[PDB]
Design a protein around this ligand. Structure first.
Ligand code: NAG
Lengths: 50, 50
């Protein structure tokens, strides 16, 4: 018998999918899949001091 | 000899305040005195007469 525990919607961590990466496009209506975070919008250069 | 201080933690509710650069500047405990409970309900640091 094999058991396994999962956890979702947390800090971006490892143990993820095998999908290939792509490039970045800005100022264009596009879909994104940034390490689990999913949505659509327009990506632009920010200036927030993280 | 040396010197060191020790405290202990408890489950509480705080009202953290972020500045325009994303750094915590002030906080208010919500179970310290009657005045502090008013601030948490109003979600403001300034209370008008009433
Ligand atoms: C926020 O950061 C900018 C640039 O680092 C600085 O000019 C400004 O004074 C900061 N504001 C603060 C510390 O309240």
């Amino acid at each position: 018998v094999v058991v396994l525990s999962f956890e979702l919607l947390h800090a971006p961590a490892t143990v993820c999918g095998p999908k290939k990466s792509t490039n970045l496009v800005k100022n264009k209506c596009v879909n994104f899949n940034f390490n689990g975070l999913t949505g659509t919008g327009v990506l632009t250069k920010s200036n927030k001091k993280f | 000899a040396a010197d060191y201080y020790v405290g202990y933690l408890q489950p509480r509710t705080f009202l953290l305040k972020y500045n325009e650069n994303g750094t915590i500047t002030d906080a208010v405990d919500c179970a310290l005195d009657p005045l502090s409970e008013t601030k948490c309900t109003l979600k403001s640091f300034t209370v008008e007469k009433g």
